[PDB]
Amino acid sequence: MNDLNTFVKDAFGRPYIPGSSLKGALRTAILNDLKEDTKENE
RNA sequence: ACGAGAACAUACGUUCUUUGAACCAAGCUUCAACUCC
């Protein structure tokens, strides 16, 4: 009923999506093939 | 009752003049605020 979480805001308080989240999502998308895509990716 | 007796190797004189510890060099790289009740 409570304990609400919060969308990411800047210091101006407008919501936005950080580019790192989309990059991590796309990293999970690209790593479908080559699951052992290693620590030292290029 | 000495090749002897006296007799300062002494006086003046800047280790000084000229000179960039400089030059080139991204605190950066890969990184989901997420997971399970």
TrEMBL record:
Source organism superkingdom: Bacteria
Family in the record: Belongs to the CRISPR-associated Csm5 family.
Function: This subunit might be involved in maturation of a crRNA intermediate to its mature form.
UniProt name for this protein: CRISPR system Cms protein Csm5
Phylogenetic classification of the source organism: Bacteria, Bacillati, Bacillota, Bacilli, Lactobacillales
Gene from which the chain derives: csm5
Part of the whole protein covered: 110 to 151 of 353
